[PDB]
Design a protein around this ligand. Sequence first.
Ligand SMILES: Cc1cc2nc3c(=O)[nH]c(=O)nc-3n(C[C@H](O)[C@H](O)[C@H](O)COP(=O)(O)O)c2cc1C
Length: 168
Amino acid sequence: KKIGLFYGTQTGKTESVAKIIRDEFGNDVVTLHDVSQAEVTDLNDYQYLIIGCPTWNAGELQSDWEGLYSKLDDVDFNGKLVAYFGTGDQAGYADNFQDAIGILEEKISQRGGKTVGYWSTDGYKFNDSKALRNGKFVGLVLDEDNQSDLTDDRIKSWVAQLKSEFGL
Ligand SMILES: Cc1cc2nc3c(=O)[nH]c(=O)nc-3n(C[C@H](O)[C@H](O)[C@H](O)COP(=O)(O)O)c2cc1C
């Protein structure tokens, strides 16, 4: 399909969000890939990518994304448009909120990927984040632990934005 959505999940929350994002695009447009089962070369099959990853253990990548991270230097993302989303806990991990998507975007952009889908920091309370880019997040940030009532509307807004930014 046109968009490849590569997610990792420890406790299932990022996966659940990935299915909502898929359905908001239309199932016809997005193929889901759990990175526990992916090879880094699977990223080659798409010109439009969505990267999903929760932050774990106070600022670490989810472990399946950690595995792939180490091979991202073997892939060329030039010519691709890449968006990012994560789930995280702004209350419990205020100093590391959504660090994982920041870490992934730094790597993939240095490997040539162009980030699309920057997201306002309005409505979140946190101390620091590697996903911060001067007053915007590098992608959609969800918090199912503290703000689950806001997820659906956040996804609808973000996906509309991505359909425009991807030029669909
Ligand atoms: C031990 C532990 C550590 C966590 N560390 C972070 C963190 O550093 N930053 C963050 O934003 N969220 C942190 N979280 C919150 C998780 O990212 C959040 O629960 C997320 O929805 C999990 O997604 P998953 O179910 O897809 O694995 C942590 C949660 C646990 C239980």
